[PDB]
């Protein structure tokens, strides 16, 4: 049976080859599509989610002196009409063209999924390769965690009209519900 | 305006009739040999 789900079987083409494989694939996504393409998608989603979570925290905590102090959703809305979001979209798309080229290289075997050889510092490149797999595991875990955490953040911001640090400091219930009186 | 179409119902004959005839024409078109011939006109019919 599967390690993560006791009452399910190991999802066929799902073993220790990819980092963080606890056998969790109840729906046969790894069988409808290639597992390496799905890992590339997962790494892209998780890295963007980690950056988004850190950005949410810092933007709620701090703002640059040349940017209006607004909630992050209001920041997206304000900079869409300001052109900064257009700049971010342009440069991200320019990088992601080569990212898609790398993904097409991944499809025909060759390079590892989500691997861009990006290593400005000497971390698991040389003299530390024995930790690399460990790092990989950590990475995807953080990825997955971020992919949840940011989500909760924004939806909590949608329901309480409070920042995540504001909700932590003042954990009042869902607005209008303490009064209750539904009958 | 447009094709003298001041009422939307006028678009029903202008589309359904050309399509229906086309469907009939399709039964002709599928029957014919649709390969190149390199001639002034196609004698295959």
């Amino acid at each position: 049976f599967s390690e993560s789900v006791p009452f399910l079987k190991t999802p066929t083409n799902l073993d220790g080859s990819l980092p963080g494989d606890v056998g969790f694939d109840p729906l046969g996504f790894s069988e409808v599509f290639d597992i390496r393409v799905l890992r590339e998608a997962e790494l892209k989603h998780g890295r963007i989610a980690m950056l988004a979570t850190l950005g949410y925290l810092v933007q709620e905590a701090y703002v640059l002196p040349f940017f209006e102090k607004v909630p992050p959703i209001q920041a997206h809305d304000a900079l869409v009409k300001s052109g900064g979001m257009s700049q971010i979209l342009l440069w991200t798309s320019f990088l992601e063209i080569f990212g898609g080229i790398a993904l097409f290289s991944t499809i025909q075997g060759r390079r590892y999924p989500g691997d861009f050889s990006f290593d400005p510092l000497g971390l698991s490149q040389g003299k530390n390769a024995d930790k690399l797999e460990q790092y990989q595991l950590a990475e995807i875990k953080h990825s997955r965690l971020a992919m949840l955490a940011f989500s909760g953040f924004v939806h909590q911001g949608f329901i309480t009209k409070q920042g995540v640090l504001e909700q932590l400091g003042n954990f009042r219930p869902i607005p209008g519900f303490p009064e209750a009186t539904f009958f | 305006e447009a094709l003298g179409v001041d009422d939307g119902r006028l678009l029903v004959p202008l589309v359904l009739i050309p399509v229906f005839i086309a469907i009939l024409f399709s039964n002709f078109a599928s029957t014919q040999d649709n390969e190149d011939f390199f001639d002034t006109y196609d004698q295959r019919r």
């Binding site: 409808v32 | 939307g8 678009l11 589309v15 399509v19 469907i23 399709s26 039964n27 078109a29 599928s30 029957t31």
Partner: protein
């Protein structure tokens, strides 16, 4: 020998147990005078359109697009509230889909000239037809849902025409027909 659907009428000559959904129900000799592949293709097309139509009847009552003119609870009135250009875009898109699926073979003389099976348009993103018994049971389920959706769409459309009320909306505050 007997139909087993109407045990007083004998089995139709062209209705063998090969085709899915076959319980021997053909009191009028349509299968004797029309191609069974064409009949099955027409039945599946009508039923699939009706399944989508019933889902739309429920959803449009439940959810509407924020575009102007798209906010009508009653689907029959929603047809006339939506701009006609969009409906003609839908019609042309569906016609293109039909032509591409049949490959120009839109007549009963040529639609199954290459075979292609009745109702098999090649739409199967998930390989759920690998098992033969599973495929046969799925075909029976599809036919049953198709016929049920045809009847249900007819009922919902006529009741919407009468009451000017959406189906789930009409289920509450029933207000029998003589009230209108």
């Amino acid at each position: 020998d007997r139909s087993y659907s109407m045990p007083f009428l004998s089995r139709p000559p062209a209705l063998d147990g090969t085709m899915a959904g076959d319980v021997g129900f053909d009191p009028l000799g349509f299968s004797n005078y029309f191609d069974l592949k064409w009949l099955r293709e027409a039945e599946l097309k009508h039923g699939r359109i009706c399944m989508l139509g019933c889902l739309g009847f429920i959803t449009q009552e439940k959810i509407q697009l924020p575009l102007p003119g798209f906010d009508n609870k009653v689907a029959t009135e929603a047809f006339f509230s939506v701009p006609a250009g969009g409906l003609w875009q839908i019609f042309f898109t569906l016609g293109a889909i039909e032509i591409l699926s049949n490959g120009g073979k839109l007549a009963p003389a040529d639609m199954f000239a290459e075979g292609r099976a009745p109702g098999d348009l090649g739409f199967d993103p998930l390989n759920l037809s690998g098992d033969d018994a599973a495929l046969r049971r799925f075909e029976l389920a599809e036919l049953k849902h198709a016929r049920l959706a045809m009847i249900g769409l007819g009922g919902m459309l006529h009741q919407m025409l009468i009451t000017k009320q959406a189906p789930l909306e009409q289920l509450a505050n029933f207000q029998p027909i003589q009230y209108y």
